[PDB]
């Protein structure tokens, strides 16, 4: 349970996630120096938390964590199998990550 492929790109659209499945990872960037690694969503059926909070110096599902000290423009996530993301012009649509023959890929969200 860990997707290798990145989410696709539909000509004209935007994708985001709200519900993070247990497994999801984020690396803290800012600048970094502390003795830490990743932020890791962990939990049972009751609730779920984030394990390893981040600091910087000078020189079923879990919500998105509270902003820290020096975040960059973009924050990258490591998704898991099961994860779902949602996709200036009208349309007349959701991307899911699946695994069949030992192969993981995000299904093309038929817009």
């Amino acid at each position: 349970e860990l997707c290798d492929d990145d989410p696709p790109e539909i000509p004209h659209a935007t994708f985001k996630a709200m519900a993070y499945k247990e497994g999801t990872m984020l690396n803290c960037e800012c600048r970094i120096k502390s003795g830490s690694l990743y932020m890791l969503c962990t939990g049972n059926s009751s609730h779920s938390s984030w394990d390893n909070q981040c600091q910087c110096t000078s020189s079923g599902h879990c919500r998105e964590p509270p902003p820290w000290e020096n975040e960059a423009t973009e924050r990258i996530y490591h998704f898991v199998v099961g994860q779902m993301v949602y996709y200036q012009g009208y349309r007349a649509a959701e991307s899911v990550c699946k695994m069949t023959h030992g192969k993981t890929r995000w299904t093309q969200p038929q817009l």
Partner: antibody, heavy 116, light 107 residues
């Protein structure tokens, strides 16, 4: 079918640097990540990291952070991996393996021997 | 880091025997993968997601397990089956492999 061919064996002096190739065929290059792995003599298998040819973004493990740098280019369909300051402890066989799930398509392997 | 422990390290057996290797994870994991390796070659995928046979693999292989204790079996050893075997996990970073198990011919 899908085939990835690696560069020949190398012998290096301590403190130097070397760059390894892995050319790909039988599929569309930028749709998949490429991973790297080394196998030391006697020792088991160890995962270095990956690259995505669409973006250029890399991820590593907390071992080979400041020792390796994955690189690639879509123009010629090859992935690279440079080793920074060679020590005798770096001696091993280096594999490129294609991503997309569980490892399945590997290269031939490349030997790097480091001594004075 | 999730590290894993294989056992035994070395197995001596005969054509026609039954075989069983074990891999022990430090934490609870969802699936386990297995490879086969012969001298001078890259690893070959053997069993994916804990029990499914890769294409080209003969019916005599399989696997099972859950939680922290996984295992693979061969019901009847053939001559081609002599080699080295590795377990593998991929539910968190970094990715880690097992140490190894070598199957030699008992004489």
């Amino acid at each position: 079918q899908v085939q990835l061919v690696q560069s020949g064996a190398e012998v290096k002096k301590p403190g130097s640097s070397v760059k390894v190739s892995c050319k790909a065929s039988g599929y569309t290059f930028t749709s998949y990540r490429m991973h790297w792995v080394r196998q030391a003599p006697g020792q088991g298998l160890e995962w270095i990291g990956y690259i995505n040819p669409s973006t250029g973004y890399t991820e590593y493990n907390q071992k080979f952070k400041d020792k390796a740098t994955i690189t690639a280019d879509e123009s010629t369909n090859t992935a690279y991996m440079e080793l920074s300051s060679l020590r005798s402890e770096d001696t091993a066989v280096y594999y490129c393996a294609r991503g997309g799930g569980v490892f399945d398509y590997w290269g031939q392997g490349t030997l790097v021997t480091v001594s004075s | 880091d999730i590290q894993m422990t294989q056992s035994p390290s070395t197995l001596s057996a005969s054509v026609g025997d039954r075989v069983t290797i074990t891999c022990s994870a430090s934490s609870s994991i969802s699936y386990m993968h297995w490879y086969q390796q012969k001298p001078g070659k890259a690893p070959k995928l053997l069993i994916y997601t804990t029990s499914n046979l890769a294409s080209g693999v003969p019916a005599r292989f399989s696997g099972s397990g859950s939680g922290t204790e996984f295992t693979l079996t061969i019901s009847s050893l053939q001559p081609d089956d002599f080699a080295t075997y590795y377990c593998h996990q991929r539910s968190t970073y970094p990715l880690t492999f097992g140490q190894g198990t070598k199957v030699e011919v008992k004489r």
